[PDB]
């Protein structure tokens, strides 16, 4: 991480893109090349407790290189700002994306596989990513889709195993992906309606969520895969590549553009 070179320098900031994880992220300009960047400021004086944490999803972000992971260029400190700067994805998140109407099985279908892309990257690297939902899905403006805010080493998404805070695994992102599918088909994870701590509790002791409403037997079976209680018991990201739902409804992830440009237009 660069201590000497200054950011203010070497960086056109703009507009605000959202608050995230401990601090404001602003679209800008990389002085250098005229790409677009994403900027994120953190004040760590304001912020000292979690430094470890963004010290660790820093490192873990740099480690990787693949079309499915946002792309990490560095970091710097000024005065008690961290800079944290990564590729800019113009298309938004597949949140975002959810709230113009709702998603057809094809779009659920394409964004879904690009996801189970990179969790299988990331998991062939021994890698989890810890916090797999639609806000943390982003897509570029040619409907590439990559994923971003990688969790700490809200309960909606949480693995059960992960709640009882027992250590875990990849499969708990494969969990996270069954009720990101849920989240992609109906707008909202299961429980949603609920205060956190009743969550918190529901997870661990309920059967696991399942979709309801008037959606293809392919896609209800691919969340019920991801959604069991046992977690050796779920698939792997490669065998859900191969997975009936996916290999009928998903397209090529250029046809997203048409899905972007409806929330740009709205
Ligand atoms: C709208 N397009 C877009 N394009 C790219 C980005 C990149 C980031 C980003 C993510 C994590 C870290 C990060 C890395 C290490 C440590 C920590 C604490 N944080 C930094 C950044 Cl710069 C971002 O927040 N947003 C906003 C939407 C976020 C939705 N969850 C983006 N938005």
Known sequence: TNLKADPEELFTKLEKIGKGSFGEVFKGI???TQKVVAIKIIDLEEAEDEIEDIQQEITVLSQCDS?????????????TKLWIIMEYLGGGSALDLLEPGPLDETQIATILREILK???????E????????????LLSEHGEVKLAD???????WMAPEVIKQSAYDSKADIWSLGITAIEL??????????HPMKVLFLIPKNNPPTLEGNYSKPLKEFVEACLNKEP???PTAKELLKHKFILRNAKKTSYLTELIDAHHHH
Request: without cysteine; hydrophobic residues 30%.
């Open 118 to 124: 990179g969790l299988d990257y990331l998991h062939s």
């Open 126 to 137: 021994k890698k989890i990513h810890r916090d797999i939902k639609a806000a943390n899905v």
């Open 232 to 234: 050796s018991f779920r």
């Open 30 to 32: 990389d002085n250098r």
């Open 67 to 79: 079309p499915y992971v946002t792309k990490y260029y560095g970091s710097y400190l000024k005065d």
């Open 150 to 156: 990688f969790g700490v080493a809200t309960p909606f």
């Open 185 to 194: 088909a109906r707008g909202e994870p299961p429980h949603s309606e609920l």
